[PDB]
Design a protein around this ligand. Sequence first.
Ligand SMILES: O=C(O)CNC(=O)c1ncccc1O
Ligand SMILES: [Zn+2]
Length: 440
Amino acid sequence: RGSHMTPKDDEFYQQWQLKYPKLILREASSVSEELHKEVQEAFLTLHKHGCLFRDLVRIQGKDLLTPVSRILIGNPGCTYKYLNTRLFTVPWPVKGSNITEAEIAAACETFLKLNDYLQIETIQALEELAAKEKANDEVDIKSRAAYNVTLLNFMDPQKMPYLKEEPYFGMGKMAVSWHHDENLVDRSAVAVYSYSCELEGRDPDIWHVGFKISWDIETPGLAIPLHQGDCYFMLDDLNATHQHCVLAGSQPRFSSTHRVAECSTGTLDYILQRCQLALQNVCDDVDNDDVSLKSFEPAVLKQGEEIHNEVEFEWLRQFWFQGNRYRKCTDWWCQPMAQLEALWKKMEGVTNAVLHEVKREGLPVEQRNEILTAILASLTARQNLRREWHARCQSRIARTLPADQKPECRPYWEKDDASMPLPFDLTDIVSELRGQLLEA
Ligand SMILES: O=C(O)CNC(=O)c1ncccc1O
Ligand SMILES: [Zn+2]
């Protein structure tokens, strides 16, 4: 049978060294009492103000509410995407940032302080790691520790008892199943501060993090006990070569999971830049509904429609699916999402202008068909993704969420809405374009 090891097992320490060396543990003792106090009060503050929410994610095609409640804190404008869900940062006061309620703002400051400390600890550990490997660059080390977000977790096993059994090693109840972390910079470290409020194998009353080798249930897994204020670090390629899970104890527990999000297509600045690139193809003297395009070159049109999808689905639908929970903690994304929606709306104008050109009496058919081939893939994806998002918004599990967390299918409009140049449902349009492309 599959098995696991804990500190109670004589082989635990040599197995940790042999098969899990890029896992590091810094016990609560190594962290100042002052910092423990601040961070723990910050967790409690965010809980009290109701800032942590179960996420309605998607896994193997199913809509699932995570047992764990979460909140993303981090650099202004940054996002972190996991399980098909793009989380938007509640901003921490990074330098040269401007300005959201007193206690919440203090809490985010605290997690930035914690971020600074864990970053220092991580750099030190990566230096020690390389030196160990020397017995056989500094910019890389710095970048692999440059945490830009933390994903905070909370779970009360007494209130959230509906937990699955760990299936391979007898590790008991899981708060989070076996996984690799998503959307991390390659070989970037993860630092976790773990805060638990107050036999054969691992103690069921105590929280652990479990590790196993990928693809491998023969090598016994490790279960690392996590007491109040213990920290652990996944270094270098550990996240790739191994999987981990979180094993529930009996008491409520928070954690702060500091990460280097791979946010190359995942910041507000990046997506604003994309929108601006798309709108370079629009005559921009005045903001009205008489949208006219500078070029119908296929490459340019394809690009514009791709950007249209990107802002629609990766930004707007993601944001509003989450029911503006952020707004409880911060108004930071309010103006940005209004601006992103206006940019998108102009892009609906653009699509209409391309459709109008395609129908233009004097357009030679060869040019028309070139345009159709340029845009069809994007419009097809737009239709399919609109169906998916609309259903994801209307799913049974979605409809049970409280009113302050209810998914909002947005943008959405009825065919009777004269403010929108095109219908929400593109079935007919896509069908017609396809048929045109096949005309003899
Ligand atoms: O709470 C922990 O100790 C470890 N958390 C995780 O492994 C984790 N991973 C990905 C996304 C959210 C998480 O909470
Ligand atoms: Zn994880």
